[PDB]
Amino acid sequence: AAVRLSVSGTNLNYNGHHIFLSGANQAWVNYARDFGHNQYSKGKSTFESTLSDMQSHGGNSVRVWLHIEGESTPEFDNNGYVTGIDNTLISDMRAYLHAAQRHNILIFFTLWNGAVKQSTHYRLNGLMVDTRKLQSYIDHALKPMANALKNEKALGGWDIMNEPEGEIKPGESSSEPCFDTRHLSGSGAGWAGHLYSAQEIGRFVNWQAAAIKEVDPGAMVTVGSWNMKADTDAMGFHNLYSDHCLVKAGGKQSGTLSFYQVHTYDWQNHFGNESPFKHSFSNFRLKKPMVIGEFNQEHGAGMSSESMFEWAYTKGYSGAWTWSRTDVSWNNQLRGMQHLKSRTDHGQVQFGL
């Protein structure tokens, strides 16, 4: 019953000591087909070699994508309700967690993806727009999974969705400021389709956050936001993921995030003024920790991998995960991680589980 990973204000702690999360996105081996149906055994050698590489270069965490759009897990009925999970999903996830533990690495599982709309999107769509379908997922898949895995020492936490803003409706006025998306006009938001209102996305996150914390009250929960324009109330923007916004959207008082996660990439070799690489954490007026959850040197406006990890570590952020084992240069990412290996000035990076 010892407390492992926790939050204090805008810092992350492990066994009561200040830590920093340093690592990478896997984010998959076989996209949407890595766990359940005896699929882990198929990718085990890649997952294990990635863990070995990371341990030797001082990384302490990996982000991995789980359901995505419901291609292989969980199990759906013909009307889009969730009926359960297959009988090797949990045991596959546990085997991976045991491998991670042997290498002192924490795993963060990402449930859904909003950045692309493919042929099984209707499965995720139902859970987004129909609250009774969402509840079936919570009851028959999410709670069983979170309850079964909560005592695994290598379980870092849960990310509800990658980039929900891929499918948001921009340019919408609202009487509630946090649901107003006029500031996202011209931003690129809604690239996969103008499908969901800000309130619909907020409800989706609020309900799943509450569910995880009902069965694992000490769990870390986040959302991977595509851009700071949707993740701060400073600079003329609005934060879709604040406690106030999520509770207004879905009504569950416990359905709040543990920490924020933001992605950042340059455009024509420059970062926009909203980027966390152009400001200190304190500029954004947030009351939870923030992890920079996707970035890389290839889209880093001339910054080295080392400089990007250094900025995150020293300017008030609580983690940095490069994108990704599958994409761009893996050696660049490992060299970045290695820069922080022995560091303790802004939290421990090498700590035992």
Short mmCIF file of C-alpha atoms in Angstrom, two decimals:
data_model
loop_
_atom_site.label_atom_id
_atom_site.label_comp_id
_atom_site.label_asym_id
_atom_site.label_seq_id
_atom_site.Cartn_x
_atom_site.Cartn_y
_atom_site.Cartn_z
CA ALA A 1 0.00 0.00 0.00
CA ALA A 2 3.00 2.40 -0.25
CA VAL A 3 2.31 5.48 -2.39
CA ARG A 4 4.46 5.41 -5.53
CA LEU A 5 3.86 8.15 -8.19
CA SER A 6 1.99 11.27 -6.88
CA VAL A 7 1.39 15.01 -7.53
CA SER A 8 2.21 17.94 -5.19
CA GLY A 9 1.09 21.29 -6.64
CA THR A 10 2.95 21.60 -9.97
CA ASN A 11 5.57 18.89 -9.15
CA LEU A 12 5.57 15.08 -9.62
CA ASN A 13 6.92 12.89 -6.78
CA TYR A 14 7.92 9.20 -6.36
CA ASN A 15 7.99 7.71 -2.82
CA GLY A 16 7.78 11.36 -1.67
CA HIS A 17 10.80 12.62 -3.61
CA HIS A 18 10.72 15.14 -6.53
CA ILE A 19 11.12 13.34 -9.91
CA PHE A 20 11.09 14.19 -13.62
CA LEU A 21 9.65 11.85 -16.28
CA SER A 22 12.14 11.37 -19.13
CA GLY A 23 11.57 9.02 -22.04
CA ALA A 24 9.78 8.32 -25.25
CA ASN A 25 6.62 7.39 -27.04
CA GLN A 26 6.71 3.83 -28.38
CA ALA A 27 3.90 4.59 -29.38
CA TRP A 28 3.14 1.14 -30.93
CA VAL A 29 4.74 -1.93 -32.53
CA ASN A 30 1.72 -3.22 -34.46
CA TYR A 31 -0.65 -0.19 -34.53
CA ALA A 32 -3.83 -0.85 -32.48
CA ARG A 33 -2.99 -4.59 -32.25
CA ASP A 34 -0.30 -4.85 -29.53
CA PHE A 35 -2.25 -6.22 -26.51
CA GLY A 36 -5.02 -8.82 -26.21
CA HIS A 37 -5.64 -11.80 -28.50
CA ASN A 38 -2.14 -13.09 -27.64
CA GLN A 39 -0.69 -10.09 -29.52
CA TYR A 40 1.93 -9.09 -26.92
CA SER A 41 3.97 -12.27 -27.52
CA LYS A 42 4.24 -11.20 -31.18
CA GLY A 43 5.78 -7.76 -30.38
CA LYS A 44 7.55 -8.71 -27.12
CA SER A 45 11.06 -8.65 -28.62
CA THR A 46 10.65 -5.00 -29.86
CA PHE A 47 9.01 -3.85 -26.66
CA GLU A 48 11.85 -5.48 -24.62
CA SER A 49 14.69 -4.13 -26.76
CA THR A 50 13.19 -0.61 -26.44
CA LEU A 51 13.14 -0.98 -22.64
CA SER A 52 16.77 -2.20 -22.61
CA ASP A 53 17.92 0.74 -24.79
CA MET A 54 16.11 3.23 -22.59
CA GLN A 55 17.38 1.89 -19.26
CA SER A 56 20.95 2.05 -20.48
CA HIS A 57 20.46 5.73 -21.62
CA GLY A 58 18.72 6.92 -18.45
CA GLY A 59 15.06 6.99 -19.58
CA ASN A 60 12.45 6.13 -16.97
CA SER A 61 9.12 6.10 -18.84
CA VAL A 62 7.35 5.00 -22.02
CA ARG A 63 4.00 6.11 -23.51
CA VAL A 64 2.18 3.35 -25.42
CA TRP A 65 -1.16 3.44 -27.30
CA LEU A 66 -3.80 0.81 -26.45
CA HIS A 67 -7.30 0.83 -28.11
CA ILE A 68 -6.80 3.75 -30.58
CA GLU A 69 -10.14 3.60 -32.46
CA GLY A 70 -11.26 0.16 -31.24
CA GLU A 71 -9.72 -1.94 -34.05
CA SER A 72 -8.95 -5.02 -31.83
CA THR A 73 -9.84 -4.01 -28.23
CA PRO A 74 -12.18 -3.66 -26.39
CA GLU A 75 -15.00 -5.95 -27.59
CA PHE A 76 -18.01 -4.18 -29.24
CA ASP A 77 -21.52 -5.41 -30.01
CA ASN A 78 -23.25 -4.72 -33.34
CA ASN A 79 -24.75 -1.40 -32.04
CA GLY A 80 -21.48 0.03 -30.74
CA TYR A 81 -21.85 -0.87 -27.06
CA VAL A 82 -18.83 -2.43 -25.29
CA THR A 83 -19.43 -5.98 -23.97
CA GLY A 84 -16.10 -6.83 -22.33
CA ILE A 85 -12.45 -7.50 -23.00
CA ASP A 86 -10.72 -10.53 -24.44
CA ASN A 87 -9.17 -13.03 -22.03
CA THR A 88 -5.51 -12.18 -22.69
CA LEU A 89 -5.74 -8.34 -22.64
CA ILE A 90 -4.95 -7.98 -18.94
CA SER A 91 -2.34 -10.80 -18.91
CA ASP A 92 -0.60 -9.24 -21.98
CA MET A 93 -0.54 -5.82 -20.27
CA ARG A 94 0.78 -7.44 -17.04
CA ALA A 95 3.58 -9.28 -18.90
CA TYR A 96 4.71 -5.97 -20.41
CA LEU A 97 4.53 -4.27 -17.02
CA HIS A 98 6.71 -7.07 -15.50
CA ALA A 99 9.29 -6.54 -18.27
CA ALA A 100 9.26 -2.77 -17.64
CA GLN A 101 9.71 -3.33 -13.88
CA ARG A 102 12.85 -5.41 -14.53
CA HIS A 103 14.27 -2.29 -16.29
CA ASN A 104 12.95 0.33 -13.78
CA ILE A 105 10.64 1.98 -16.37
CA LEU A 106 7.11 3.37 -15.82
CA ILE A 107 4.46 2.78 -18.47
CA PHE A 108 1.70 5.22 -19.49
CA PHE A 109 -1.13 3.64 -21.52
CA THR A 110 -3.06 5.91 -23.96
CA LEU A 111 -6.63 4.68 -24.45
CA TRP A 112 -7.96 6.51 -27.59
CA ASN A 113 -6.74 8.59 -30.56
CA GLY A 114 -8.35 11.73 -32.07
CA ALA A 115 -5.60 12.64 -34.59
CA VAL A 116 -6.79 10.44 -37.46
CA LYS A 117 -10.16 9.18 -38.60
CA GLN A 118 -10.02 5.67 -40.16
CA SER A 119 -12.42 2.80 -40.96
CA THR A 120 -13.40 1.81 -37.41
CA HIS A 121 -13.94 5.43 -36.27
CA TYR A 122 -17.64 4.73 -35.81
CA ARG A 123 -16.72 2.62 -32.73
CA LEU A 124 -15.05 5.55 -30.98
CA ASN A 125 -17.69 7.97 -32.33
CA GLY A 126 -20.44 6.15 -30.48
CA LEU A 127 -18.60 6.47 -27.18
CA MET A 128 -18.09 10.21 -27.81
CA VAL A 129 -21.67 11.17 -28.70
CA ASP A 130 -23.83 8.56 -26.82
CA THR A 131 -23.47 8.63 -23.04
CA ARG A 132 -25.00 5.12 -22.67
CA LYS A 133 -22.35 3.68 -24.98
CA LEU A 134 -19.64 5.54 -23.02
CA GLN A 135 -20.98 4.01 -19.80
CA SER A 136 -20.72 0.47 -21.29
CA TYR A 137 -17.03 1.05 -21.96
CA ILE A 138 -16.52 2.27 -18.41
CA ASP A 139 -18.35 -0.65 -16.80
CA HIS A 140 -17.18 -3.54 -19.00
CA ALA A 141 -13.60 -2.57 -19.98
CA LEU A 142 -12.05 0.48 -18.30
CA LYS A 143 -12.87 -0.31 -14.66
CA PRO A 144 -11.85 -4.02 -14.92
CA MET A 145 -8.55 -3.03 -16.53
CA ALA A 146 -7.67 -0.24 -14.08
CA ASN A 147 -8.62 -2.36 -11.07
CA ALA A 148 -6.61 -5.41 -12.21
CA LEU A 149 -3.38 -3.47 -12.92
CA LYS A 150 -3.31 -0.94 -10.06
CA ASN A 151 -0.79 -2.85 -7.90
CA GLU A 152 1.78 -3.21 -10.70
CA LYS A 153 4.83 -1.18 -9.76
CA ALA A 154 5.62 -0.31 -13.39
CA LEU A 155 2.19 1.23 -14.09
CA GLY A 156 2.73 4.99 -14.40
CA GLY A 157 -0.79 5.98 -15.41
CA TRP A 158 -3.44 6.57 -18.07
CA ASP A 159 -3.82 9.08 -20.93
CA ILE A 160 -7.49 9.22 -21.97
CA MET A 161 -6.95 10.44 -25.53
CA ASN A 162 -4.29 11.54 -27.94
CA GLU A 163 -5.10 14.97 -29.48
CA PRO A 164 -8.86 15.36 -29.13
CA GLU A 165 -8.56 18.70 -30.97
CA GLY A 166 -8.08 16.71 -34.18
CA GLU A 167 -11.85 16.36 -34.24
CA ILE A 168 -13.08 19.53 -32.46
CA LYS A 169 -15.36 22.17 -34.06
CA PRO A 170 -13.39 25.45 -34.22
CA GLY A 171 -14.82 29.00 -34.47
CA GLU A 172 -17.80 28.40 -32.18
CA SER A 173 -19.11 31.10 -29.83
CA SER A 174 -20.28 30.18 -26.32
CA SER A 175 -21.74 31.88 -23.24
CA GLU A 176 -19.37 29.64 -21.25
CA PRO A 177 -15.87 30.98 -22.03
CA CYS A 178 -14.09 27.61 -21.75
CA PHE A 179 -16.35 26.10 -24.47
CA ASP A 180 -15.73 29.02 -26.86
CA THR A 181 -13.46 27.93 -29.74
CA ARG A 182 -13.15 31.22 -31.70
CA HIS A 183 -9.50 31.37 -30.66
CA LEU A 184 -8.89 28.05 -32.49
CA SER A 185 -9.99 29.55 -35.83
CA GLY A 186 -6.95 29.55 -38.16
CA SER A 187 -5.03 27.19 -35.81
CA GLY A 188 -5.46 23.97 -37.79
CA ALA A 189 -7.67 22.37 -35.13
CA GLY A 190 -10.34 20.03 -36.54
CA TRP A 191 -8.00 18.61 -39.21
CA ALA A 192 -9.52 15.10 -39.04
CA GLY A 193 -13.09 16.53 -39.14
CA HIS A 194 -15.28 19.16 -37.46
CA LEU A 195 -17.02 16.42 -35.45
CA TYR A 196 -17.31 17.21 -31.73
CA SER A 197 -18.06 20.27 -29.64
CA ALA A 198 -15.74 21.37 -26.85
CA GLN A 199 -18.41 20.25 -24.38
CA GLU A 200 -18.57 16.71 -25.90
CA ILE A 201 -14.80 16.27 -25.61
CA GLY A 202 -14.90 17.58 -22.04
CA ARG A 203 -17.59 15.09 -21.06
CA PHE A 204 -15.65 12.17 -22.61
CA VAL A 205 -12.57 13.03 -20.56
CA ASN A 206 -14.46 13.88 -17.34
CA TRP A 207 -16.32 10.53 -17.25
CA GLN A 208 -13.28 8.34 -17.93
CA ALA A 209 -11.10 10.22 -15.44
CA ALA A 210 -13.76 9.71 -12.78
CA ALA A 211 -14.06 5.99 -13.60
CA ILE A 212 -10.33 5.28 -13.25
CA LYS A 213 -10.16 7.17 -9.96
CA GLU A 214 -13.18 5.25 -8.61
CA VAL A 215 -11.31 1.90 -8.76
CA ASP A 216 -7.73 3.29 -8.45
CA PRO A 217 -7.99 6.54 -6.48
CA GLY A 218 -4.22 7.14 -6.56
CA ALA A 219 -3.96 6.76 -10.35
CA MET A 220 -2.33 9.38 -12.54
CA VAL A 221 -4.62 10.49 -15.39
CA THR A 222 -3.91 12.93 -18.25
CA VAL A 223 -4.86 13.90 -21.87
CA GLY A 224 -2.36 14.53 -24.68
CA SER A 225 -3.35 17.98 -26.04
CA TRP A 226 -2.23 18.87 -29.57
CA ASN A 227 -1.28 22.51 -28.89
CA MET A 228 -1.05 24.95 -25.98
CA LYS A 229 -3.92 27.04 -27.50
CA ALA A 230 -6.31 24.47 -25.99
CA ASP A 231 -4.43 24.03 -22.66
CA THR A 232 -4.06 27.51 -21.04
CA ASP A 233 -6.28 30.40 -19.95
CA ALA A 234 -3.34 32.81 -20.45
CA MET A 235 -2.35 34.65 -23.67
CA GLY A 236 -5.97 35.00 -24.90
CA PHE A 237 -6.59 31.24 -25.09
CA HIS A 238 -8.79 28.84 -23.11
CA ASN A 239 -7.96 25.63 -21.21
CA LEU A 240 -10.36 22.83 -22.23
CA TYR A 241 -8.95 20.50 -19.52
CA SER A 242 -9.16 22.59 -16.34
CA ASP A 243 -11.15 21.19 -13.41
CA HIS A 244 -13.79 23.90 -13.97
CA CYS A 245 -14.25 23.09 -17.67
CA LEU A 246 -14.32 19.28 -17.28
CA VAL A 247 -16.80 19.35 -14.41
CA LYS A 248 -19.02 21.86 -16.29
CA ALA A 249 -18.86 19.55 -19.34
CA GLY A 250 -19.56 16.13 -17.74
CA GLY A 251 -20.77 16.77 -14.18
CA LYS A 252 -18.44 14.35 -12.33
CA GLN A 253 -16.65 16.17 -9.50
CA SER A 254 -13.85 13.56 -9.28
CA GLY A 255 -13.29 13.59 -13.05
CA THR A 256 -10.24 15.84 -13.10
CA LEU A 257 -6.74 15.30 -14.50
CA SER A 258 -3.61 14.68 -12.41
CA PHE A 259 -1.31 16.49 -14.81
CA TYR A 260 -1.40 18.19 -18.21
CA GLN A 261 0.36 16.97 -21.32
CA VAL A 262 1.02 19.12 -24.38
CA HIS A 263 2.57 18.41 -27.74
CA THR A 264 4.73 20.87 -29.68
CA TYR A 265 6.22 20.95 -33.17
CA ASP A 266 7.72 23.83 -35.16
CA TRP A 267 6.38 25.19 -38.45
CA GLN A 268 8.73 26.30 -41.23
CA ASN A 269 11.60 26.03 -38.69
CA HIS A 270 10.05 28.31 -36.05
CA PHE A 271 8.02 27.65 -32.91
CA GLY A 272 4.82 29.69 -32.51
CA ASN A 273 4.53 32.02 -29.52
CA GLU A 274 2.28 29.49 -27.76
CA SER A 275 4.99 26.78 -27.60
CA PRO A 276 6.31 25.56 -24.21
CA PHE A 277 9.80 25.81 -25.74
CA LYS A 278 9.40 29.65 -25.95
CA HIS A 279 8.37 30.18 -22.31
CA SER A 280 8.82 28.93 -18.77
CA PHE A 281 6.07 26.77 -17.28
CA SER A 282 4.97 29.71 -15.06
CA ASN A 283 3.92 31.76 -18.13
CA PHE A 284 0.89 29.49 -18.65
CA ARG A 285 -0.66 30.02 -15.19
CA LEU A 286 -1.35 26.33 -14.55
CA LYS A 287 -2.01 24.66 -11.19
CA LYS A 288 -0.96 21.08 -12.11
CA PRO A 289 2.31 19.71 -13.50
CA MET A 290 2.85 19.72 -17.24
CA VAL A 291 4.68 17.12 -19.31
CA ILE A 292 5.83 17.95 -22.82
CA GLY A 293 4.46 14.68 -24.22
CA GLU A 294 5.59 14.80 -27.86
CA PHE A 295 8.46 16.66 -29.57
CA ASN A 296 11.60 15.94 -31.56
CA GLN A 297 14.75 17.59 -32.89
CA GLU A 298 13.56 17.17 -36.48
CA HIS A 299 10.75 19.64 -35.66
CA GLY A 300 12.66 21.60 -33.00
CA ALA A 301 13.44 24.93 -34.70
CA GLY A 302 17.20 24.28 -34.61
CA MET A 303 17.32 23.09 -30.97
CA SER A 304 19.38 19.91 -30.24
CA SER A 305 17.66 16.95 -28.46
CA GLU A 306 19.86 17.77 -25.45
CA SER A 307 18.67 21.43 -25.42
CA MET A 308 15.02 20.39 -25.65
CA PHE A 309 15.35 17.93 -22.67
CA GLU A 310 17.30 20.66 -20.82
CA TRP A 311 14.60 23.30 -21.40
CA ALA A 312 11.88 20.95 -20.12
CA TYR A 313 13.95 19.91 -17.08
CA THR A 314 15.06 23.40 -16.00
CA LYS A 315 12.12 25.64 -16.91
CA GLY A 316 9.48 24.14 -14.60
CA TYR A 317 8.05 21.26 -16.62
CA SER A 318 7.66 17.75 -15.09
CA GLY A 319 8.46 15.49 -18.02
CA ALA A 320 9.55 15.18 -21.61
CA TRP A 321 8.69 12.32 -24.00
CA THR A 322 10.08 12.33 -27.54
CA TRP A 323 8.14 11.21 -30.58
CA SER A 324 8.92 8.27 -31.16
CA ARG A 325 10.59 4.80 -31.25
CA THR A 326 8.97 4.19 -34.68
CA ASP A 327 9.57 7.66 -36.20
CA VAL A 328 12.61 9.89 -37.05
CA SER A 329 16.00 9.16 -35.39
CA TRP A 330 16.00 6.88 -32.33
CA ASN A 331 19.65 7.72 -31.60
CA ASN A 332 18.79 11.48 -31.37
CA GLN A 333 16.13 10.63 -28.80
CA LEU A 334 18.42 8.42 -26.71
CA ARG A 335 21.16 11.10 -26.77
CA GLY A 336 18.60 13.58 -25.40
CA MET A 337 17.54 11.22 -22.57
CA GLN A 338 21.15 10.50 -21.72
CA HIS A 339 21.75 14.23 -21.07
CA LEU A 340 19.53 14.04 -17.99
CA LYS A 341 20.66 10.59 -16.73
CA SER A 342 22.63 11.73 -13.64
CA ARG A 343 20.67 14.92 -12.91
CA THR A 344 19.07 15.85 -9.58
CA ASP A 345 18.88 19.72 -9.66
CA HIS A 346 15.17 19.69 -10.70
CA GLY A 347 14.15 16.24 -9.48
CA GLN A 348 15.53 12.72 -9.71
CA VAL A 349 15.55 11.10 -13.13
CA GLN A 350 17.09 7.77 -12.07
CA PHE A 351 15.00 6.33 -9.27
CA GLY A 352 14.15 2.77 -8.24
CA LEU A 353 10.57 1.53 -8.42
#
